[PDB]
Structures are given as C-alpha cells and as structure tokens.
Design a protein around this motif. Structure first.
Motif, mmCIF file in Angstrom:
data_model
loop_
_atom_site.group_PDB
_atom_site.id
_atom_site.type_symbol
_atom_site.label_atom_id
_atom_site.label_comp_id
_atom_site.label_asym_id
_atom_site.label_seq_id
_atom_site.Cartn_x
_atom_site.Cartn_y
_atom_site.Cartn_z
ATOM 1 N N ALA A 62 6.766 -1.346 -12.813
ATOM 2 C CA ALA A 62 5.426 -0.764 -12.743
ATOM 3 C C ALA A 62 4.345 -1.712 -13.253
ATOM 4 O O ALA A 62 3.173 -1.561 -12.880
ATOM 5 N N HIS A 63 4.707 -2.687 -14.083
ATOM 6 C CA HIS A 63 3.759 -3.639 -14.649
ATOM 7 C C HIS A 63 3.937 -5.044 -14.090
ATOM 8 O O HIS A 63 3.381 -5.998 -14.643
ATOM 9 N N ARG A 97 -13.795 1.114 -0.800
ATOM 10 C CA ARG A 97 -13.185 2.439 -0.934
ATOM 11 C C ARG A 97 -11.711 2.348 -1.315
ATOM 12 O O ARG A 97 -11.221 3.155 -2.119
ATOM 13 N N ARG A 112 -1.811 -10.835 -6.415
ATOM 14 C CA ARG A 112 -2.745 -9.706 -6.417
ATOM 15 C C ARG A 112 -3.825 -9.812 -5.348
ATOM 16 O O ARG A 112 -4.809 -9.065 -5.390
ATOM 17 N N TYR A 148 2.298 -8.972 -7.034
ATOM 18 C CA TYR A 148 2.217 -8.070 -5.892
ATOM 19 C C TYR A 148 1.003 -8.424 -5.046
ATOM 20 O O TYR A 148 0.086 -9.105 -5.499
ATOM 21 N N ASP A 161 -12.001 -0.699 -4.807
ATOM 22 C CA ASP A 161 -13.151 -0.815 -5.710
ATOM 23 C C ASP A 161 -13.221 -2.185 -6.391
ATOM 24 O O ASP A 161 -13.800 -2.319 -7.474
ATOM 25 N N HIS A 162 -12.665 -3.216 -5.747
ATOM 26 C CA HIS A 162 -12.765 -4.581 -6.260
ATOM 27 C C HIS A 162 -14.172 -5.137 -6.092
ATOM 28 O O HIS A 162 -14.797 -4.995 -5.032
ATOM 29 N N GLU A 210 2.948 2.950 -3.481
ATOM 30 C CA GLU A 210 1.697 3.547 -3.036
ATOM 31 C C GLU A 210 0.767 3.735 -4.230
ATOM 32 O O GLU A 210 1.144 4.358 -5.224
ATOM 33 N N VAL A 211 -0.441 3.191 -4.132
ATOM 34 C CA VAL A 211 -1.474 3.486 -5.116
ATOM 35 C C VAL A 211 -2.112 4.831 -4.817
ATOM 36 O O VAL A 211 -2.247 5.696 -5.691
ATOM 37 N N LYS A 212 -2.528 4.992 -3.568
ATOM 38 C CA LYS A 212 -3.089 6.214 -3.017
ATOM 39 C C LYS A 212 -3.019 6.067 -1.505
ATOM 40 O O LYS A 212 -2.685 4.984 -1.007
ATOM 41 N N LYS A 236 0.635 -1.338 -3.134
ATOM 42 C CA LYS A 236 1.034 -2.573 -3.799
ATOM 43 C C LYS A 236 2.387 -3.010 -3.250
ATOM 44 O O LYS A 236 3.324 -2.212 -3.186
ATOM 45 N N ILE A 292 -1.916 -6.366 -2.455
ATOM 46 C CA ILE A 292 -2.444 -5.061 -2.072
ATOM 47 C C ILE A 292 -2.678 -5.066 -0.567
ATOM 48 O O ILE A 292 -3.497 -5.838 -0.061
#
Ligand SMILES: NC(=O)c1ccc[n+]([C@@H]2O[C@H](COP(=O)([O-])OP(=O)(O)OC[C@H]3O[C@@H](n4cnc5c(N)ncnc54)[C@H](O)[C@@H]3O)[C@@H](O)[C@H]2O)c1
Ligand SMILES: NC(=O)c1ccc[n+]([C@@H]2O[C@H](COP(=O)([O-])OP(=O)(O)OC[C@H]3O[C@@H](n4cnc5c(N)ncnc54)[C@H](O)[C@@H]3O)[C@@H](O)[C@H]2O)c1
Ligand SMILES: NC(=O)c1ccc[n+]([C@@H]2O[C@H](COP(=O)([O-])OP(=O)(O)OC[C@H]3O[C@@H](n4cnc5c(N)ncnc54)[C@H](O)[C@@H]3O)[C@@H](O)[C@H]2O)c1
Ligand SMILES: NC(=O)c1ccc[n+]([C@@H]2O[C@H](COP(=O)([O-])OP(=O)(O)OC[C@H]3O[C@@H](n4cnc5c(N)ncnc54)[C@H](O)[C@@H]3O)[C@@H](O)[C@H]2O)c1
Ligand SMILES: Nc1ncnc2[nH]cnc12
Ligand SMILES: Nc1ncnc2[nH]cnc12
Ligand SMILES: [K+]
Ligand SMILES: [K+]
Ligand SMILES: [K+]
Ligand SMILES: [K+]
Lengths: 461, 460, 464, 462
Positions: B350-351, B204, B306, B355, B207-208, B332-334, B339, B357
């Motif tokens: 941003a790129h 959730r 990552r 990072y 989604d990896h 914040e991703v959501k 990250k 998660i």
C-alpha cells in the motif's frame, strides 16, 4: 570590372557577406540542397529572372540557385524591403542585382526592366521567380516573346498566386507555375510564424512603443493575420480581430480573441455613420493583413484614436487608404519609413499637434519596411521550396514541348507532399528535434509508408 | 415506455436541467431546430446512433427528433456516458442504451439493442456513428439491414479512416459523409475541445499540480495540438513526439521541444533503444495518435516513478495496457483512476513508491475522467452531423436503381458554404461581428460577397 | 539654442531635429512625468537646483532632463554606459542648451572623461547641489575624487538595483556623505521598469543584433529576480524553451510555478572551478544565454567553453562582469559583424577562418544588451521610474541637507524610499495613460478593509 | 477501536481518503521533509492544537504531520462547502477528533467549531490555535477568554484572518501572539496566486462545463488572488477585464496585458443604478470576486449582468457578492449541488425555460473549494510547511507561561524569518526536480550574503 548591377553602396559588401555566412548556418534545408545537388548541377542552363525582397535571406536563395548552375538577374519586389548590405554582397559576387532600400516607384519599375533586358535587348531568360506577380505581369503585358522561351514561374506569395489563377481563368497565362505559397513549410511557417516574429519587431524599431496593455485591431485572420495577432498578443496587447470569413473568425474566437467589425453590424456602406466610432477611438494600433483593398479606409482613419499607429503587413499598400491621407493631411517624417500624419489639415502642421497618426513604411509591408522581414530559419523553408520548384519546372522544359503537350501542362500546381515533408524534416533537425520512425506494424496500422507521406493531400494541419 | 436501459432513470430531471443550459450554449444546433422545424426534413428517418451519450449528444438527439426523425441510441465508449443525459433522453421516450462504466460485453449488447427492436431488426434507414463500431457491426453481422439505409455520417478521425479502408477494399455498402473534416468540426472539436477537456480530466482524476512538471505528448495532429496547449497553458514543460516532420515543425515553431522515446527515433523493440534518461524525467504522458502501441511496454518500464499515463485518442491500444494487466498489480484509487504497481503482479504494498497512475484504464481520458468537450465546441460538430443526415436522407440512396447506386457510393464532405454557415452561428454565439465585403472588395479578391471565401484547397 | 553654446560633447549635432521629433512623441507616452511638469511648473520647486546626472542618454532620459529643467533646475549630464546613448537624444539635449557629454560607443577613457565634464565647469568644480545616478559610478567618483563637492550636495537619487546596493554598503561602512533616496524600490519602478522593461526590450535587442528566430530554440536565463523574470518572459513569449538558473530558492520556486525548468550550469549546482563540474550536456544544447544577476562571473570561462557552437551570449545586468569577457579577449579571436555584435572564434587567439563554425555571438561586448543593441525600455515604462526620480529630487532638494548643522546631519544621513502614497499617485497616472479606470471605494468598503478612500491601500509590508 | 469523538458525513469513505492521502504525501515534499526531520525530536509533544481550516486531503497531511511531531488536535473546517468527506473520514478513522462535512448549515458550522473547543462538555486543555479566516480566533476571544490564558499562540493562514488579527492588536484586544503564515513568500506568492490559477478554472469547469475560450470575464481585484484568478481565465483564452481600487495593482494588470475597467461610470459608486456601466456589464459572461472586501459585486451590478452570466467568489467570505439581495428578490433553481440558477424574473416560482437567469457557484462561498478541491497538494505543501514551522516556533516560545512583563514584550503578529521561507522553497524546488546553484564564496561576498542565505533583504518583494 563587373558593372552589371545597381545598389545603394557597394562598400557594404563585406558586411553583407558576414551576415550571409551567419544566415547559412540558420538555413539547413537550403544549405542541404546546396550540398545535395551541387555535383549534379540541376540548374545548369537555367536563366532566372528573380523579383523578391533583396534581403540577406534572398541572398542565400540566390547563391543556392547559382551554386546549382543557374544564372540570374535580380530585383526587389518592394521599394522598402531591400537590405542594402545584402544587395551589395550579391553585386560584389558578380551577380546582376538592381535593388536598394527606398526606391521611388519609377526606380522600382526601372530595376525590374534591368533584369528583363541585358545590353538593351531581352535577356535569354527561361525561368521566373516572383513574389507578388509584378514581374510576371510585366512579362505578360510587355514581353510576350520572352515568355515563349520561359519554362515556368515559381511564385512566392498569396497575392501573386491569386494573380496567376486569374490569368489561368482568363486564358491569359502563358507558362505553367508552381504555387510555392501553399507548401505547408511555406504558408504555415513563413506566412504565420514569420509575421509572429517580425511584426512586433518592426513596430518596436519604428516607434519603440510599449505594446503591453494597449489596444490593437488586426484586420484579417488568415495565415498572416493569425501570426500578426499572436505577435501582438504575446507582447500583452489586447487584440481584437476583424474578418469577413466566418470560419477564420471562429478560429479567432476559439483562440481567445474578441471579433469585431469597424462597421456597425459589419455593414460597410461607405458612410461615416457606419463607423463604430467608440471602437475605433479606443484603438492604439491597427494592422492590415488581408491582401484585399481599402480594409483600413478613410472613415476609419478619421475615427481612430489620436496618435494611433497604422501599418500594413499584406503584400500591397492599398490595404490602407494612404491616397486619402496624402490628399488631405500633412505628413511629417519622423525618420525613414516613419511618418506622423496630422489630421488638422493639409497645408503645414503644428510641431506640437496632438491630433496625428503614425504611419509605418508609408503603408508598405511593415515587417520588411521597418525591420528585416522574416528570420533566416523561417525563410529556410520557403526558399528550399523555391529551389525545388525551380528545379522541377526547369527540368520539365515546358517551352520546348509541342503545342498539344503545352496545353496539357499549363497549370498552377503545388509541390508534392513528400517534398514538403523532407523540407520540414531538415527544419526540425535544425532545432535539434528528433522525429520518431514508425514500426512496420504501426505504418500498416494507420495505412502509410514508413518514409511517408504521412497525411492525405486533404489534410489541413 | 420501457425501451431503454440506463443507470438510473431518476437522474432525468437533473439531465433535463443540464440540457436546457446546454441548448443556450449551442446556437448552431438550436438554429437548425428553429429553421428546419417547419420543413421536418427528417420526417420518416429512422436513425441508428452510436456516440458518447453526453449532455451534448442529448441536444443532438433532440435536434434530430425535432426535425422529424426517430432514433435508437447507444454510446461509443464504455466510460463516456453521462448518466443524467441518458436518463433524460430515456425519460423523453427515446430508446437509448448507455451508462458510465459498461463492460466490453455490455457495450456490445447496447449497440445490439439499437439494431434490434422486439427481437427483430429495426427498419433503420440512416446511421450516425463515432469511431465506426456500429458501422462495422452492421457490415459484418447485419449486412442485409444495409440494403435499407441511405447513408452513414461518421464523426471522428479514426472512423473516417475505417470508412476509407472499406471503400478502397470495395466493402462499403452505403454512401457516407466525412463529418470530421468540416473545418467547424476538425479544427474546432479535435483541437480546441481537447484544449478545454484534457487538463480538466487530469485535474478531476488526480488533482495534481501541472505547473512546473514535465509532460510528453505523443502526436501533434489536431488532438495533439490541443492537448499540448491544454498542458502548456497550465505551465507544464511540454515535449512533443511525432512521426510526421511537418507536424513536428509546427511543434517547434509553437515553442515545444520535439523528442523521441527512442534513441535517434528508432523503435527496434529492445530496451536498449529506449531513451531512459528522457523517460525518467517525464511526469505525464498523453497519447494522441490514433496509432497502436505508441506508449509501449518498454516506455512504461522506463517512466519516472509516479508518472501519470493517459490516452485521448479514440482507442485504448495507444498504451500497452495489456502488458500492465499481465505483469503489474492494479490498485483502484477511485473509479477510472488506477495505481499500477511495477513491483509485481500478485499483490502490492500500500505504501510502494514505484507505481504509475493510469487514467480511465487507457480509454479516452477527457470523456472518461471528465465530461469531454464543452457544449459550445460540440455545437460545431453536431450541427454538421444534422446537416449531413438531412443531406444523405434526402438523396434516398437505398431507393436508387442498381446502376445509379454505383456512382453514388462515396465518402464526401459537406460543401464549404455550409461549413461557413455553421461557423457564422458559432461566431455570433461569442457576440463576434463578421464584416461584410463591399462589391469592389469581393471582386478584388475573386469571391462572392456571400462566400465561400476560400478555395477548397485552403488549410486555415 | 543659446548663442555660441559649446558646453557639450555629442556624436553628431545634426541629429538634433530628429531627436526633438522623438522627444515630442515620448512626451505623449509619459503622462506621469508630463503630469509633474504641468503640476509643478508654476511652483518651480527645483529653482536653484544644480543637478549632476549620470544615466543612459536615451530619448526617455531626455524627457526626464527637460522635466527637471522645466521645474527650475540646471543640469550637467552624462550616460552611465558606454553603449546606451541614443545619439539623436544627446544631440537634441545639447541643441537645447543643456550640457551633455555622451555618445554611443564610448571608450572606457571617454566614459570617465564625460562624467568629469559634468563635474567640472571651465576647469573647476561646478557648484552642484544635487546628484541623480544610475549604477553608482558618478556617486563613487564624487566620493573618491571630489569629496569636497559633497559638502554642498543635498542628496543622491539612485535609479537601479546595483547602485542601491553600493549605497547601502557605503552607509553601513560610514563612507556615505549625503542622504539618498532609493528610487529602484518604488513599486512603480522596480516592478515596472526592472521586470516589464526587460520583457519589452530583451527580445527587441536580440532581434536587432542577430535577427535570429527565437521560437523553438533553447535559452538559459541566469537569475530570476525582477530582471530575470522579465527576461524569461521576453523569451518564452517568443516561443523559446527557457531554462532558469538561480541561487535563491524562493525565486527558483517562482520560476517552477511560472512554467520553467530550473537547472544549474554546474553538476548538482556545485562550482569547484574545474571543467569537470560543468554540465556539458546541458550547455551543449543551449542556443542563448542571458545573465540577469547583478553578480560577478555567472557565465564563466568554463561555461563559455562548453556552450553549443554559435550560441548567443548576452548580459542585461548593469555591469559587463556577469560574463567573463576578459577570458574571451585573452584567448579567442573577435570578428566584428556590425557595431555591438561580435563573433568570438573559439579556435584560437591570433587569426580566425572566415568560415569557422566554432564561434559564439556576443552582444554589446557583454554590456547591458537592451540598451546596447536596441533602445532600452520604452517611454511608457520609463515614465514610472522617472516620475519617481523627479519626486525624489524635489524631496531632497527641498530638505537642504547640506545646510544643516553637523548634529542634525547625522540624524538624516539615510537611504530612504518614497512613501507609498506617492508610489500610488504615479501608478494612477500610468493607469490613466492606458485608459484604465480605477474604482473608488465606498466609505463602508474603506472602513471594512481598514484603509482611507484616498489610500494608501496596502501596508508597507505588501509585496504585490 | 471505541473511538466516537468525531462527526463526519460517512466514515466508510476512510479507505478512499487514505489512498488519496498516500498520493498527496508524495506531492508534499516540504511537509513530509518536516515529518522526517522532526519526528525524533518531537517538538510538538504536549501541544494541543485547535484547528479550523478546510478539511481537505491537503489539510489531512498537515494534521498528520502535526500529530507525527507530537501534537494532539481537535479539528473543524473553516467553510461549510470546502470539506472533502473522504479526507474527514480518513482523519476520523485514524482516531483524530474531526467535526466536518461538505454542505454544513450555518448552525452546523458553529456547532463543529464548538465541538473542537469543548471536550466532554468542558473546555479542552488547548494550548495552540491554527486558524484560516479568524472564525475560531473570534469565538475564543468573545466566548472563551479563560482558554486563551493558557494558549501560546495562533498561526493564521489567510489574508482575511490576518487583517482581523491586526485589528484586534490595534484595539488592544488580541490576547495571544500570532504568526502571519499568509505573508511567507512560499504562502502568499504560491498559494494565493498560483493556487487560484490552478483551481479557479477547475471549479468553473466542474460546476458548469462551460467553454471559457473566447468569452468575456471581469475579475474584481488584482491582489495575489486576483492575479492568479485572472491568469486562470486568460490562459484558457478568456478575454479578461480587471477592476481595482489600488492603482499600483491596476498598473500591474495593465502591464500584464489586461484592460482595467470599473463596474461604475468613472469608477464612482454612488449607489444608484445610473452609476452602473450597463453596456460593460451587459457583455460580461463571468464575474469573479477576489478582494476580501464587502459588496464588490452589488445588487445593481447583478441586475445589469448579461443574461446567463456565471457569478462566483474566490475571496474568503461570501459577502463579496450581494447574495442576500438575490435570496430576497429572485427565485433559485438548483442545477446540482453548489450550482444554482438565479431567475431574475421574480421571487415566487420560475419558468423552467426562462432565459433571464444568472448561474451562481457555491452560493457565493469560496468557489475553488466549493465546486472543486481547492489548491493542489504540491502548492499547499508550501503553505502547510509554513504552518508546521509556525506552530513549532510559538509552542516552543511558551507565551502562556511567561510573566506579565514578558508577555507584553512578545504580544505581536509576526512572520517567519526569511531563512525558513527559503528552506521551504528549496524543498518545493527539489520536488520539481529543480537544481539550485550554490554561490561561490566570492559571489556571496560580492552581493553581500551568506552562501547558505538568506539571499534577499527583508524589504524584497519578489
Ligand atoms: N509581410 C509578409 O512577410 C507576408 C508574408 C506572407 C504573405 N503576405 C501577404 O499578406 C497577405 C495575406 O496573406 P495570407 O496568406 O494571410 O492570406 P489569407 O487568404 O490566408 O488571409 C487573408 C484573410 O483576410 C481576410 N479578409 C479579406 N478581406 C477582409 C476584410 N475586408 N476585412 C477583414 N478580413 C478580410 C480573408 O477572409 C482572409 O482570411 C497577402 O497579400 C500575402 O501576399 C505577407
Ligand atoms: N478524445 C477526444 O475527444 C477526441 C476528439 C477527436 C479525435 N479523437 C481521436 O484522437 C485521435 C487523433 O485524431 P486527430 O484528429 O488528431 O488525428 P491526426 O491525424 O490529425 O493526428 C494524429 C497524429 O499522430 C501522429 N502519430 C502517429 N503515429 C505516431 C507515433 N508512433 N508517434 C508519434 N506521433 C504519431 C501522426 O503523425 C499525426 O500527426 C484519433 O483516434 C481521433 O479519433 C479524440
Ligand atoms: N538592463 C536594464 O534595463 C536593467 C534594468 C533594471 C536593472 N538592471 C540590472 O540588472 C541586475 C539585476 O537587477 P534585479 O532588480 O533583477 O535584481 P534582483 O536582486 O531582483 O535579482 C538578481 C537575481 O540574481 C540571482 N543570482 C545572483 N547570483 C546568481 C548566480 N550566481 N546564479 C544565478 N542567479 C544568481 C539572485 O538570487 C537574484 O534573485 C542589476 O545589476 C540591475 O542594476 C538592468
Ligand atoms: N480561495 C482561495 O483559495 C484563497 C486563497 C488565498 C486567499 N484567499 C482570500 O482571498 C481574498 C484576497 O486575498 P489576497 O491575498 O489576494 O489579498 P490582497 O490584499 O492581496 O488583494 C485584494 C485586492 O482587492 C482589491 N480590492 C479591494 N476592494 C476592491 C473593490 N471594491 N474593487 C476592486 N478591487 C478591490 C485590493 O486593492 C487588493 O489589491 C482574501 O479574502 C483571502 O483570505 C482565498
Ligand atoms: N526576410 C525575407 N526575405 C525575403 N522575403 C521575405 N518575405 C518576408 N520576409 C522575407
Ligand atoms: N530607455 C531607457 N532610458 C534610460 N534608462 C533606461 N534603463 C533602461 N531602459 C532605459
Ligand atoms: K531577416
Ligand atoms: K461537456
Ligand atoms: K526606448
Ligand atoms: K486539492
């Protein structure tokens, strides 16, 4: 000129010795004890009556006990479980052993007696190592004077511990015992993972049957039933599990098994009408794991699918009503420890009859009867515990205590958790695993010593 | 009715639909309702409750109410509340103070709102707790309230540990039942619940794909066992770390490689001690210990770019998130997915590719990024909770004379017969059929046909 | 049974009654093969067929042999591997009056002699007209040494991946003399035998040879084709930590998705032949290496030198050259533990210390380990393969390629698979043997997906 | 700036979608490798692609790869429930025409496809089609034949769409050549199987939060989707039974450790209730359809299912389940979006505490995309790398510009060459950190391959 033994074929000794040398490399906890305690000789003066499956793994146990100073007299605790090359190697080493694969019941009893008696008189035994309680029972029934001089019993298996606890309850137990079974590095290593390795092993050796896609019923879901169920499920069988213990049944459900009873609504009233005939007629393989009596009974045997395999991995063969089958059905030996039982009648059979069952090891412990039992690296844990248990009770010297002190010490106990952990650590290092060491701050945070023990005695793992 | 605070009371109808479904998934709990409704064994009970305000906890709450109790409720974690569950309980006229996404200050305020009614101490007489926070606040800040309370029923391993520390130190004021160590709790909840909900939460949040990737699970107790299986069954290559050699032996036998983040297992504080090669290959780290700093600053610096970092133990200090708050920039991703950019503290590209998660800000990931354990698993834990509340409430410890209280002050488990009775209701919910021993069989193995079927030493 | 029968060579004829007991059990495990026996016995479709057969002389091959005979064929049989015969199977076949030349533990010389005993009868070429082969050895001897016999042979039915590859090479080179059916690439063969067979029998053979605990130990499987897939599962289901090597990136992708780490014995996957290219850190951690490739020297001398002390080495591909056992025979001392199990002492060639710790355990001397150290695939799996074998034999024998004029012969000189409809009919009988129930399409459903209710259900492109 | 040629749920979700696209790019090395490899060459310069496929984050990375290689696109989703609204917003905010939102009606679904076909009320100058399921392909053939005259090819994603293409080819009605993207091994045996392994239990958990361990499932079908679906459930501890019409696939289910059963007695579906194995269906907690066929979970099966069983479909179209029967006869209670209790007590009203209901997910539509997010990026990497390569091949072939005689020779449905399948696979393996071994020259000679591949004959099934 050593003659104080009886084995199937002494010329198998060189082969047995080759396999013992390999097994030592698979048993680091046991060989670690050998190296750690050899100089001290903590079993010097110990005289051990041993009764346990005369396998290559038991060979490493025996020679560890001897290397630590003990003298032993050995027999097997099952008529089919001896590896004859192991018995030969031990006998060729000058160690009294009375054991071969395929004993009769009379020969089994004679073998135990040959350990108890030396030159026709009681041996000067002072320790007992047992697996299932048969030797313990014979000593209590027939040789009480020998038990006066025995310091303790170290008992390997669940069924033997039950028998000790019954004696303790009745006030008939004469010497203290260590319950080796309930070390975690025994019960949750040997009983479970050992049967995972060796149940499907024995079934393949006995029948060479494909197991994937076929239906199995495992009676029981204790430590042995858990490992047996996994042995079959990992091969792709559709495994159903029966249990009387609702907690163990809950584990079976949560582990992804369907929980069923041979009897409608689980009520075993002794009638044929109580048998779930639809269920039993679908089963290709039934395995009993309970240590109980008659859990695969005559009416189940009558209802089983044609050509189903029947076997027992609990300690004693009365889990299956083989007596019923001997009395009513014709037995055809396929090969040693593999019989077709023809349900068409008792007097003879058609060689091409389709209505038969396949019984493994005449219902005796199937992993040891049709294969080699548990592998060395698993028996490492059980037998490291056995050695430590022998040392502990021998050093306590119960037989030499005053009567009042004996009463305070007559018990069935387990080994302390620190020993259990140190055995486990050697096993983990044998896999090349690396255990992390707690920092002082972390040990204080969870309230343990850095060296352990790491769990309270109540912990179940 | 206004004695509550939730995120959105209009979610009540939705929560009630999910409670009706959950009831059909919780046969042990619903069997307790049917069988004790007539007796009303909790008539007169006033229960302070502090546990994750989920749909499953709603069924527990309404079971206690159906048996006669009054309650005042809060969550035991800032991210674990299901807002539709809290609304449905509030809409039923039950005081509750809980929403998803509380601040630490709001979390403390919510517990205080159960303790206080109309600016005064409520006349509570029972405590139900998950982690020990409510228990700790009562002992430190409201010790006089504890003179009216008959007992505490604690849910989880961490909280039991805290209860025992208080007993050893002579600071526990009321008797307590360790609900965690019922077999139908510990070996159902702690293991199987995490097996269901850990991979659920990771999917959730990210989604990896998990198959084919490398995981490191720190710990192999009940939560570590279930977590490892949750990942292995998805096809992860799972490595396990442990300080307990017995648990490590089980990991090896279960088919896992046992490794340490530290060379030779020695955590001496230096970067040099980190197995940088091992950590540079790990795609996912999961902490399961109930210990402190088991995924530390040096491990976080060594982790593969990552990688996902998460915690399923009770407290968010298993991972050194304070180090990451101090040194690295959070994107914040959501909600509950960040990250963490290891390039610096003030701002990020941003790129940027460097990072990590972090899920749920290091808090309980199954409840933070999903819904925690499923109803049919929580059924076991919560049926034990109800039985423990009945047992302590009927003993009426707070009404005993001073001498009788000294002998009654302990932390006990429920008898095995009750454990088995919960298990039987769970088995029936799967359609399983338990076999009944014959009299001869029961005699043969030395048990009653009724049970208990195992000695108290048995480990299952 | 036939009076005075001596046209065989086996290890021990007294094992025959035991073999027959096991053949009767196997018949109950092989419903597709026994269904063909029941369906075709009256028609006698193989009456007049004289089959040279070369395939592992197991109980399963015994049921195949007696099916061909029950359909009218005469056969003369040998094993296709020196270690794969079950001596009680060979004895029961010989005791039935069927010429068979096979025993467990042949020398290479004896292996060749056994094939020639099938080819010859009373010192002269037998009037064979059919060939059934497993790996191509018999096919090769006939082409090389007895080319004139091929003038009377209607077809070859080849069992396994390696053998088909040899046939395709001959076909492309114009050296194949008779048509053939690729039995391997039926789905009920390849994706049943090659995969699930090895799943059953790889861990079986390792347990019988070593009795080693597998759970928690490290394995390297070289190859992830059908045999590699089944072998990896055999080990992973026991709890091994399995790493997989591949040269085919699609097969490597499957291994990743199946939950395995994909690694190379060589740094960056590049084998320059030197010791410096060996990933010694990886190999020094491996407890078990299994080769599954059908290729040459995939476990080479430098890998064998780098392997962890006391690792087990075995091969489940068709030929032993997957492992450089020749290097080990040249350089290291071999200590036989028991038949088909050798400790190979890396301390030197001449002597060995009985307690040396620096050895490897080699199973079946590098030959097919499932057949060498256990009994190969189980009957219910071999049922699929051998049903296909019977149908292939019937098809080619009824085609009578040897009786065609030269022009018509060039038209039919091919390597073919069996049609998908027959593949499905074999599968259906296998499913029924498990008690499985296949659903029947409605007319509307069959129209919706564009198939007939009776099948076939998939296009020939479908990969399953 | 000034861009209005789109229709999405909420453009303000764009920043969120962009954050997830940047994450998905790091999960999609084969697709991102194609971007880096072909960016300078611009192989899709001049391509104008009509796209119809689930408007997910993964499809967002596909779209932007096509655009980065030179193409212009107009996009819609191929399912009313599969769009991720943050993905559609990110694409729209990048100036790309997209018409898609989660929860479309059937009329809105068709309108969205039409918005891609038309620009300013007239046929767009499309010359390429990328489709998933064949809906856009069908509308073009039936309603816009003049547009197909100038279209160089169709690249079709999924099994159902391929079957529809082959039917057109058989009947001589296919107007442009196609590439069957589905039958690359890095599509069919990656997406169809492993994707459903990941996303089936995912969607079931998000929709119901039901414990799966210990419960009974029936999977209808054991093709690629049915294999992945059965594993998705078994690995969670379900007791999984499998139904099949293909005896070869059923053989695989058996050997894989599943019991093979039929909903019908002796597998004969004669349309009567008497034919239903009521005893078997009365024990099933979860039924999943995987077939691409019609009515494989029929009305009589639904009537016989255990109370409170979950019913879902992961095949491409919802007609695998007779949901029409349920809309006609039973009362629907929405639990939350894409989760409905179907009350078998009657059509008009329901008791809120009725125990006799079924739980239907996504109204019978693709459950993994409807109740979760479909397949993960690292799996879709394989499918969408194949899509980009297929687009490049057919656009460079320029079928629309060929003479009539040359078109007749190229009008076909083909797959990508195995060499390309392998090149996609290697990028996927590198993404896992895997290390493929290089054959020596002698080893390549021994097995008869080039060292660089292809390594298998075209007949090989993997
Ligand atoms: N063969 C081996 O290598 C091996 C190894 C260890 C133990 N054992 C033997 O196996 C037996 C079981 O040992 P364990 O450690 O698993 O004991 P256990 O007490 O953990 O498990 C036995 C289980 O059988 C269940 N049971 C009893 N009667 C039943 C019935 N009628 N129907 C269904 N289930 C029933 C009990 O509820 C219990 O859970 C003992 O005899 C033990 O000595 C054999
Ligand atoms: N999130 C959930 O839903 C949930 C459910 C139940 C329990 N929990 C929590 O999870 C935690 C673990 O609970 P449990 O029941 O598994 O306890 P446990 O005691 O059974 O397991 C903890 C394990 O961590 C190991 N460990 C400790 N320090 C370690 C270190 N530095 N490195 C590696 N291993 C280390 C211990 O040896 C032990 O085996 C507790 O905080 C508990 O409250 C969470
Ligand atoms: N023992 C048995 O019971 C049994 C059964 C069937 C087949 N076989 C034999 O097993 C072998 C393999 O058969 P298969 O059907 O799996 O073939 P396959 O073509 O399906 O698989 C072989 C695999 O090996 C890989 N490979 C080749 N060289 C390699 C290398 N250097 N390193 C790593 N991987 C490499 C290839 O990429 C291929 O995927 C053949 O010799 C076949 O005859 C044995
Ligand atoms: N949801 C997803 O992400 C996703 C992914 C890929 C494909 N799909 C779709 O799923 C469907 C199946 O795809 P596939 O690649 O597995 O196709 P497939 O051809 O490989 O498998 C379908 C299977 O269904 C079986 N079947 C047909 N009718 C049946 C019946 N009445 N009962 C039982 N079994 C029956 C067939 O025998 C076949 O094996 C298609 O509609 C496809 O487009 C969905
Ligand atoms: N190999 C073995 N040796 C001794 N006792 C055993 N019990 C089970 N397996 C055994
Ligand atoms: N049992 C067996 N019999 C014949 N050929 C085989 N190939 C693999 N296993 C076999
Ligand atoms: K053994
Ligand atoms: K939940
Ligand atoms: K066999
Ligand atoms: K996704």
């Amino acid at each position: 000129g050593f003659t104080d033994y009886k084995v199937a074929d002494i010329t198998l000794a060189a082969w047995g010795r080759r396999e013992l040398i390999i097994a030592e490399s698979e048993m680091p906890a046991l060989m670690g004890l050998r190296r750690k305690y050899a100089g001290q000789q903590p079993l010097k003066g110990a005289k051990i009556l041993g009764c346990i499956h005369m396998t290559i793994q038991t060979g490493v146990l025996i020679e560890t006990l001897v290397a630590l100073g003990a003298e032993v007299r050995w027999s097997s605790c099952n008529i089919f479980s001896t590896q004859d090359q192991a018995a030969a190697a031990i006998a060729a080493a000058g160690i009294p052993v009375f054991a071969w694969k395929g004993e009769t019941e009379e020969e089994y009893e004679w073998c135990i007696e040959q350990t108890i008696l030396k030159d026709g008189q009681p041996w000067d035994a002072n320790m007992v190592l047992d697996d299932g309680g048969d030797l313990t029972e014979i000593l209590h029934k027939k040789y009480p004077q020998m038990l006066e001089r025995i310091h303790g019993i170290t008992e390997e298996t669940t069924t033997g511990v039950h028998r000790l606890l019954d004696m303790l309850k009745n006030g008939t137990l004469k010497v203290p015992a260590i319950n080796v079974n309930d070390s975690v590095t025994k019960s949750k290593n040997d009983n479970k993972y050992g049967c995972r390795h060796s149940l499907n092993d024995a079934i393949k050796r006995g029948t060479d049957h494909l197991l994937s896609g076929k239906q199995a019923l495992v009676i029981g879901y204790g430590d042995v039933g858990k490992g047996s169920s996994q042995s079959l499920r990992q091969e792709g069988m559709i495994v159903k599990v029966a249990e009387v213990d609702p907690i163990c049944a809950m584990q079976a459900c949560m582990d992804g098994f369907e929980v069923v009873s041979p009897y409608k609504n689980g009520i075993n009233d002794g009638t044929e009408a109580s048998i779930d005939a639809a269920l039993l007629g679908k089963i290709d393989l039934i395995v009993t794991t309970t240590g109980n009596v008659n859990v695969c009974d005559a009416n189940m045997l009558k209802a089983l699918k044609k050509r189903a395999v029947v076997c027992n991995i609990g300690h004693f063969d009365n889990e299956i009503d083989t007596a019923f089958m001997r009395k009513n059905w014709a037995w055809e030996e396929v090969k040693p420890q593999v019989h077709k039982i023809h349900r068409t009648g008792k007097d003879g059979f058609d060689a091409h009859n389709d209505d038969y069952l396949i019984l493994l090891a005449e219902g005796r412990l199937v992993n040891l009867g049709n294969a080699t039992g548990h592998p060395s690296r698993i028996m490492d844990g059980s037998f490291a515990n056995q050695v430590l248990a022998q040392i502990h009770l021998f050093e306590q010297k119960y037989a030499d205590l005053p009567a009042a002190e004996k009463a305070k010490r007559l018990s069935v106990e387990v080994l302390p958790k620190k020993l259990d952990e140190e055995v486990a650590l050697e096993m983990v290092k044998g896999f090349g695993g690396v255990v992390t060491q707690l920092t002082p701050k972390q040990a204080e945070y969870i309230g343990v010593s850095v060296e352990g023990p790491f769990k309270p005695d109540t912990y179940r793992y």
